[PDB]
C-alpha cells in the first residue's frame, strides 16, 4: 500500500542516535512534544558528502554533522559564558507559557489590540543566570529565553573562541552560494521545553547547536497556503497564526495538509535552514538548557534574467511586497485587508 | 418615517417631461425595464446653473439641458447619415439578446473558455441600414448596435455639422477641469430595447443624446464592492459580472446594497458621466432607434501632493494596478486569482 509506505516514511527524526562510548540514547522520543502533522526526517550528512552540497545548493535543509563550525564553543556553558561574555547587556524574553511568540516592537503601534504574550527585559549576563537559578530554586513556572546578537563587548576569551570557528568552511559556503554578507550571529540560550513557534526568516541560516538538544520542524516555502502568516504589518509578521498545540482548523483549514521536515540537533550539529523555509524550534523536554549560535547571511541577489514559472519563495517575496505597497499607498496598514477583500470577493472567489 | 422619505426619494427619472407644444409625454414609465434596486434621479439643470458647474467640478453626474453641444446633429437620422457619413467601414455588434456584453478582443487569448455573446461585423453604413430594415421587415428577433469612432472618412456635410458643435462650451469645460485631450467621439446607433450592461470607463464623458431616448443608470465608484467587475485580464474587464435581469445574490451578495443614479436623456440632452462611475444604458422599449455621440476626454493628471484618505476612484486605480502588476510579474494572468487567495485566506479573512 502507498499509505503503508507513507506511514513509515514519516519517520520523524529517526531512532535517537547513540552517543560515542556507549553512553546510551542522548534523548528518547518521549521528550518531543505531540503534534498533529506528519513529518519526514531531514538528512544528517557529512560536510564532505556531495549530497549535502547538493542540498545546500538547492536551498534544501540538511544537518551537517562534522563541520567543526563552532568547535571552540562546545565548551560553552553558563559558568564559562558568565566569566567571559563581558558586561554588555543581553536581551532576554520572559513568558508565562512555553511558546515564545515574538513581536516587532516598531509595529506595536498600528494594531492597538494586540497584547504581548512574552515581554523582553535587558539585563547583564550574570543577572540572567541568577534569574534562571532563582526560577529553578523556587520551582517556579516562569520561562526565560536569552537571544542576543554577539557584539563588540564580549570578553577576551569569547573572541578567541570566535576566531576558532571554521571560517574556511562557511566562508567557502558563502562564496559557493553567492550569498550576501554575514549580518549577525545570534546567541540563543533556552530553558528546556522552550518553543519558538513556526516562522520564516529573510536570510540564509547555518544553525550551530552548542549545548543541549533542539527539535527543529521545517516546512518548505510552498506550504505558505497551509501556515497562515500574520499580515505583514502585524507585529508577528512572518510567524504562523496557527497554534500548533491547538490548531483552529475552521480558521486555517489547509493546516490539515501540512507536511514537515524534522530533526534533532545536538552539540556540534549544523542545520542549514534555507531562507524562507518555515521553522519550529523546541528545546527538548527535561533536556536542560540549550545553547545555539546561528549565522545569518543575506540571500543571493535577484537574478538578471528571471526564469518562469516562479519558485515558491519568489511568490512569497511578491506577496510580501504587495502588502507593503498597499500599506504605504493607502496611508494606513489597516486598510490593506479591506482593500484586498474588495478586490477578490466575487472576482477571484 | 425615514423609510417613508426614502421610498419616494427613489424617484427614478421623475415623471416623464412633456414636450413643447403640448406634444404629450415623450415616454412613459412602461418603456423602462424592471430592476431590483432603488435609484435616485440625476438632476437636470441649465448649463448656466451654478449647481451644474458644482456637480461637474465634483465629478458628479448631471444632465445639461441646453448646451447646444451637438445642436447641428439633431437633424441626424438614418437617411441623412447614410447620404453623408461617407463610405468608411463601421463597427457593428450583433446579439441574440438585448444585453450587448462587449469584449476586449486582445484579451480573448488568456481565457479560452469565454464564449462571445455578441459578435462584431465591419460594414459600410448603407449595409447596416439595410440590415436593420431587413430585420425590421422580417420581424426577426436579431439585434444590432452600431458603435464607431467618427473618423476622417466622414462626408462633407458631417464635417460641417461637427464644426457647428459647441466647442466653446466643452473646450472651456476641458480647461476648467484640467482634463486631458479629447480622444474620440463615439457614434452609437441602437435598436429600441438595446442594453449596454453596467461598466465604467477610464475617461471623462459628455454623453450627447441625438435621437430617441436612453435610460442611464449610474453608480458611484464607491459601489465597486456591490458590482463585482470582471478580473482586469478578463475580456469583459470593467463590466459588472452581475446580470441585472437575474442577479445571483449568492455569488454577488453586496449587489443587494447597490443604489443607482438614474435619468432619461432625449434629443439635445448632455449627460456628464464622470470617469470611473458605473453606467448602465438602455434604449427605451419601443422607442425606435437611438442616436448618441459621446465625447471622451483623458482625465486630469495625478496631483503633485496626494491628499489622504484616498477617494474611491483612486482605490479603483490602485486595485486595477495591483492586478496588472501581478499579471506581468507572475508570467501569466491566470495565476493572479490563485496568488490573491493564498494572500488573504485566513490572513485578512
Amino acid at each position: 500500500m502507498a499509505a503503508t509506505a507513507a506511514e513509515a516514511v514519516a519517520s520523524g527524526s529517526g531512532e535517537p542516535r547513540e552517543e560515542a562510548g556507549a553512553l546510551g540514547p542522548a534523548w528518547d522520543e518521549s521528550q518531543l512534544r505531540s503534534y498533529s502533522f506528519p513529518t519526514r526526517p531531514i538528512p544528517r550528512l557529512s560536510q564532505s558528502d556531495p549530497r549535502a552540497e547538493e542540498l545546500i545548493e538547492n536551498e534544501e535543509p540538511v544537518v551537517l554533522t562534522d563541520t567543526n563550525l563552532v568547535y571552540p564553543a562546545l565548551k560553552w556553558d553558563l559558568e564559562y559564558l558568565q566569566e567571559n561574555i563581558g558586561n554588555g547587556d543581553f536581551s532576554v524574553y520572559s513568558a508565562s507559557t512555553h511558546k515564545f511568540l515574538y513581536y516587532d516592537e516598531k509595529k506595536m503601534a498600528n494594531f492597538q489590540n494586540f497584547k504581548p504574550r512574552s515581554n523582553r527585559e535587558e539585563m547583564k549576563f550574570h543577572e540572567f543566570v541568577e534569574k534562571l537559578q532563582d526560577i529553578q530554586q523556587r520551582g517556579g513556572e516562569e520561562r526565560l529565553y536569552l537571544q542576543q546578537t554577539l557584539n563588540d563587548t564580549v570578553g577576551r576569551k569569547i573572541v578567541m573562541d570566535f576566531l576558532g570557528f571554521n571560517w574556511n568552511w562557511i566562508n567557502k559556503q558563502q562564496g559557493k552560494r553567492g550569498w550576501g554578507q554575514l549580518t549577525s550571529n545570534l546567541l540563543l540560550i533556552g530553558m528546556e521545553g522552550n518553543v519558538t513557534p513556526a516562522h520564516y526568516d529573510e536570510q540564509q541560516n547555518f544553525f550551530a547547536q552548542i549545548k543541549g538538544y533542539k527539535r527543529c520542524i521545517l516546512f518548505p516555502p510552498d506550504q505558505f497556503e497551509c501556515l497562515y502568516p500574520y499580515p505583514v504589518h502585524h507585529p508577528c509578521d512572518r510567524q504562523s497564526q496557527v497554534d500548533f498545540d491547538n490548531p483552529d482548523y475552521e480558521r486555517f483549514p489547509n493546516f490539515q495538509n501540512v507536511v514537515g521536515y524534522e530533526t534533532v540537533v545536538g552539540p556540534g550539529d549544523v542545520l542549514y535552514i534555507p531562507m524562507y523555509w518555515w521553522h519550529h524550534i523546541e528545546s527538548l523536554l527535561n533536556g536542560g538548557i540549550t545553547i545555539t549560535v546561528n549565522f545569518w547571511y543575506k540571500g543571493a541577489p535577484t537574478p538578471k534574467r528571471i526564469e518562469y514559472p516562479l519558485k515558491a519563495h519568489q511568490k512569497v517575496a511578491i506577496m510580501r511586497n504587495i502588502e507593503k505597497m498597499l500599506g504605504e499607498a493607502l496611508g494606513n496598514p489597516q486598510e490593506v485587508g479591506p482593500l484586498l477583500n474588495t478586490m477578490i470577493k466575487g472576482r477571484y472567489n | 418615517m425615514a423609510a417613508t422619505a426614502a421610498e419616494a426619494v427613489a424617484s427614478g427619472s421623475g415623471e416623464p417631461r412633456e414636450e413643447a407644444g403640448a406634444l404629450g409625454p415623450a415616454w412613459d414609465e412602461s418603456q423602462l425595464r424592471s430592476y431590483s434596486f432603488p435609484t435616485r434621479p440625476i438632476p437636470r439643470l441649465s448649463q448656466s446653473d451654478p449647481r451644474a458647474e458644482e456637480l461637474i467640478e465634483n465629478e458628479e453626474p448631471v444632465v445639461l439641458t441646453d448646451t447646444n453641444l451637438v445642436y447641428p446633429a439633431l437633424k441626424w437620422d438614418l437617411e441623412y447619415l447614410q447620404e453623408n457619413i461617407g463610405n468608411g467601414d463601421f463597427s457593428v455588434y450583433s446579439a441574440s439578446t438585448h444585453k450587448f456584453l462587449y469584449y476586449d478582443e486582445k484579451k480573448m487569448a488568456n481565457f479560452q473558455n469565454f464564449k462571445p455573446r455578441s459578435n462584431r461585423e465591419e460594414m459600410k453604413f448603407h449595409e447596416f441600414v439595410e440590415k436593420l430594415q431587413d430585420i425590421q421587415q422580417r420581424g426577426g428577433e436579431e439585434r444590432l448596435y452600431l458603435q464607431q469612432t467618427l473618423n476622417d472618412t466622414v462626408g462633407r456635410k458631417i464635417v460641417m455639422d461637427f464644426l457647428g458643435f459647441n466647442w466653446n462650451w466643452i473646450n472651456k469645460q476641458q480647461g476648467k477641469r484640467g482634463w486631458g485631450q479629447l480622444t474620440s467621439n463615439l457614434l452609437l446607433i441602437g435598436m429600441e430595447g438595446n442594453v449596454t450592461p453596467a461598466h465604467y470607463d477610464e475617461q471623462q464623458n459628455f454623453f450627447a443624446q441625438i435621437k430617441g431616448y436612453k435610460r442611464c443608470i449610474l453608480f458611484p465608484p464607491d459601489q465597486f464592492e456591490c458590482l463585482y467587475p470582471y478580473p482586469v485580464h478578463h475580456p469583459c474587464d470593467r463590466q459588472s459580472q452581475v446580470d441585472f435581469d437575474n442577479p445571483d445574490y449568492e455569488r454577488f451578495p453586496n449587489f443587494q446594497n447597490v443604489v443607482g443614479y438614474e435619468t432619461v436623456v432625449g434629443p439635445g440632452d448632455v449627460l456628464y458621466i464622470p470617469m470611473y462611475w458605473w453606467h448602465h444604458i438602455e434604449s427605451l422599449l419601443n422607442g425606435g432607434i437611438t442616436i448618441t455621440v459621446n465625447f471622451w476626454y483623458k482625465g486630469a493628471p495625478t496631483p503633485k501632493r496626494i491628499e489622504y484618505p484616498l477617494k474611491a476612484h483612486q482605490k479603483v486605480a490602485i486595485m486595477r494596478n495591483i492586478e496588472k502588476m501581478l499579471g506581468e510579474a507572475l508570467g501569466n494572468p491566470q495565476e493572479v486569482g490563485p496568488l490573491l487567495n493564498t494572500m488573504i485566506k485566513g490572513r485578512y479573512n
Binding site: 515574538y102 513581536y103 516587532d104 516592537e105 537571544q147 550576501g180 549580518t183 549577525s184 545570534l186 526568516d201 529573510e202 536570510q203 509578521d237 512572518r238 545569518w296 543575506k298 540571500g299 535577484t302 528571471i306 519568489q314 517575496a317 511578491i318 510580501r320 511586497n321 504587495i322 | 502588476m325 501581478l326 506581468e328 510579474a329
Partner: peptide, 15 residues
C-alpha cells in the same frame, strides 16, 4: 522593471 520590483526582498530576522 516591474517584476524585479516585486521580487526584491527585505532581510528581516527573528525579532
Amino acid at each position: 522593471e516591474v517584476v524585479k520590483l516585486l521580487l526584491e526582498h527585505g532581510a528581516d530576522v527573528x525579532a
